């Protein structure tokens, strides 16, 4: 409905049509692949999403996660959907060498028992919270305007928009976790 | 005399006000029109959604019950939800495939009703007046900036927006009292 929300919306198409708005042109109505603009826009949007999502937040960091090796040999694969691998409360030496998990401390790639680490994975663009989506769209619009069509007045406004959205993301982050500092203290 | 209007609506007037920034006359209906009428609505809707999701004293509902299904125990994630949190503790909630996900237990299988705090969305034509004026000015600034750059239509909207922002502040501060001296008593 024109009042409440349009029915059965498509998020990616809306994001693309909003990105072309900064240039000053009307909608596309299909999101096809023959057109030149769509192919250029999609890669930038994907890259910005990947960059922003990999900074670490309170709803991404899975402290307890279990990895297990296979049977034939003793190795663990390194999927392309992994963003950060660290140990909870100590120093860690983990990296990738030939699509396998490497431990610099022992200089080997042969694990024999399941281990526990923390990691951050990727999520589809359409399941992030609203403020993150708006922030990402504004950022991506900035590159798209800067690299393909230089306009002097569409700029100088997206900067204020970006700062205002960044603030709101910050106090959104500070509300999920209470973060008390006087815990673990008590005695007569 | 007076200005008893004819056929007044709270959306057509907003669209007309947005159009007046460039300097074009008013339309009579939204069923047919050129690109501009179809270009303003997107910005207006986006700005409304963005502003409504900041949290106010008349939005936040502390107590609310969500009930699971009966056949397969799960809870859906409607697109009208804006914020999901908890009253006085830390929370881990997110969306995964159109369902409610709890990161702490790494599962999507609830069994009993849960109580949380959430913020829903309302139609444009039922918000208080000051908010509507603020939203209209905010949308008009962007509409002027992106399609027709005029140096006189600007430099005034900013001045108006500052005053509207202030007014929203003192309106918000009066709904609640917020007395710090409460919850204290002793001889």
């Amino acid at each position: 409905m024109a009042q409440y929300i349009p029915l059965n919306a498509n998020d990616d198409l809306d994001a693309i049509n909003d990105m072309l708005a900064a240039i000053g042109e009307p909608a596309v109505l299909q999101l096809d692949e023959g057109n030149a603009d769509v192919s250029n826009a999609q890669r930038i949007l994907h890259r910005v999403n990947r960059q922003v999502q990999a900074k670490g937040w309170n709803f991404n960091i899975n402290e307890a996660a279990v990895l297990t090796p296979d049977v034939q040999d003793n190795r663990i694969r390194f999927l392309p959907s992994y963003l950060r691998v660290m140990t909870a409360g100590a120093t860690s030496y983990y990296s990738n060498m030939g699509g396998y998990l490497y431990d610099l401390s022992t200089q080997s790639t042969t694990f024999t028992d399941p281990i526990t680490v923390e990691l951050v994975e990727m999520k589809p663009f359409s399941e992030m919270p609203v403020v993150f989506r708006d922030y990402i769209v504004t950022k991506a619009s900035r590159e798209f305007n800067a690299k393909f069509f230089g306009s002097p007045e569409s700029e100088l406004y997206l900067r204020e928009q970006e700062a205002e959205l960044y603030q709101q993301v910050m106090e959104y982050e500070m509300d999920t976790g209470r973060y008390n500092m006087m815990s673990d203290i008590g005695r007569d | 005399a007076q200005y008893i209007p004819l056929n007044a609506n709270d959306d057509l007037d907003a669209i007309n006000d947005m159009l007046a920034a460039i300097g074009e006359p008013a339309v009579l209906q939204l069923d047919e029109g050129n690109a501009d009428v179809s270009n303003a609505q997107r910005i207006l809707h986006r700005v409304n959604r963005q502003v409504q999701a900041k949290g106010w004293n008349f939005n936040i509902n502390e107590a609310a019950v969500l009930t699971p299904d009966v056949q397969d125990n799960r809870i859906r994630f409607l697109p009208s939800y804006l914020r999901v949190m908890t009253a006085g503790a830390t929370s881990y909630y997110s969306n995964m495939g159109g369902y409610l996900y709890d990161l702490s237990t790494q599962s999507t299988t609830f069994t009993d009703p849960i109580t949380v705090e959430l913020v829903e969305m309302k139609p444009f034509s039922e918000m208080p007046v000051v908010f509507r004026d603020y939203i209209v000015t905010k949308a008009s600034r962007e509409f002027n900036a992106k399609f027709f750059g005029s140096p006189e239509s600007e430099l005034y909207l900013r001045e108006q927006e500052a005053e509207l922002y202030q007014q929203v502040m003192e309106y918000e501060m009066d709904t609640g009292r917020y007395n710090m001296m409460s919850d204290i008593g002793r001889d």
Partner: protein, 140 residues
């Protein structure tokens, strides 16, 4: 996703699917033990709307266990095209949405009855096939 059930004994309930009109929503009471005493509720005297996504109950829910809400789109057309008029986007949008919705409830209805026969037939066939084949071939 167009059929939902909730436990009985409340006063407020939620709607969780899109609809084109307020006459396409059906509410009924369900008795699990004896599915011959079900009753259908009607707007105005039994329940009232509050906002586009939530309703309120007004009758006594005694002797029932489940409350069911589902969508039932009509079959009559909405927009009538005629020669001489002007083409607009809203007509196309509504015409598309009606057909999409109808196909949705059709699939949702049919799959429910199809699955229990399908999987049983498949499992029985596979079990018998492998058992007989390997057993008799090894025996011979």
């Amino acid at each position: 996703s167009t059929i939902t059930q909730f436990p009985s004994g409340n006063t407020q309930y939620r709607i969780e699917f899109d609809y084109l009109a307020r006459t396409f929503v059906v509410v009924t009471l369900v008795n699990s033990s004896n599915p011959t005493l079900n009753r259908v509720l009607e707007v105005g005297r039994d329940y009232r709307f509050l906002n586009p996504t939530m309703i309120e109950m007004l009758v006594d829910q005694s002797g029932f266990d489940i409350v069911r809400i589902h969508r039932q789109t009509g079959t009559d057309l909405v927009v009538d095209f005629r020669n001489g008029s002007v083409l607009t986007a809203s007509d196309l949008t509504n015409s598309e949405l009606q057909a999409i919705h109808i196909a949705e409830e059709g699939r949702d209805q049919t799959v429910d009855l199809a699955k229990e026969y399908a999987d049983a037939a498949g499992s029985s066939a596979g079990n018998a096939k492998d058992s007989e084949d390997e057993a008799r071939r090894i025996a011979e």
